[PDB]
């Protein structure tokens, strides 16, 4: 009746699709934003420090505001892209307070 020797079970999601349940993922998403937050922590204020970024194409780009710093760093994580979207939205609407 069967076509062959054995029949391996189907994975519901595609092979290699990452997924997780519980409170661990939302903590990882929050910790991902805090990891991006720590880069812009000492930049805030008049006595703050600039950030030097060098992308894969080897073009130097120094900046103080968080609008173009986040544009240079191509963000993979969706939760960390939330800070990048509001920074460009704040840069597009007002133009101040992108780090705060």
């Amino acid at each position: 009746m069967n076509f062959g020797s054995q029949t391996p079970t189907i994975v519901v999601l595609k092979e290699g699709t990452d997924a997780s349940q519980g409170k661990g993922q939302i903590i990882s998403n929050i910790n991902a934003c805090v990891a991006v937050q720590e880069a812009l922590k000492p930049t805030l204020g008049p006595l703050g420090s600039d950030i030097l970024i060098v992308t894969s194409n080897q073009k130097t780009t120094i900046s103080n505001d968080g609008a173009t710093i986040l544009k240079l760093l191509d963000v993979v994580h969706p939760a960390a892209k939330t800070l990048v979207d509001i920074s460009r939205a704040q840069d597009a609407e007002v133009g101040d307070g992108t780090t705060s």
């Binding site: 903590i27 991902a32 990891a35 191509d74 963000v75 993979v76 994580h77």
Partner: protein
């Protein structure tokens, strides 16, 4: 949390520096460029 932890692409080639020791290499790197053209 899993073993992969990625936020930006190509984390292996990108490496940060910080603290007083990070700024120390910058001024000392200028001495190598300055010392060549000092003579």
């Amino acid at each position: 949390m899993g073993r992969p932890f990625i936020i930006v692409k190509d984390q292996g080639n990108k490496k940060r520096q910080h603290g007083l020791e990070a700024k120390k290499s910058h001024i000392l790197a200028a001495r190598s460029v300055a010392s060549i053209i000092k003579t």
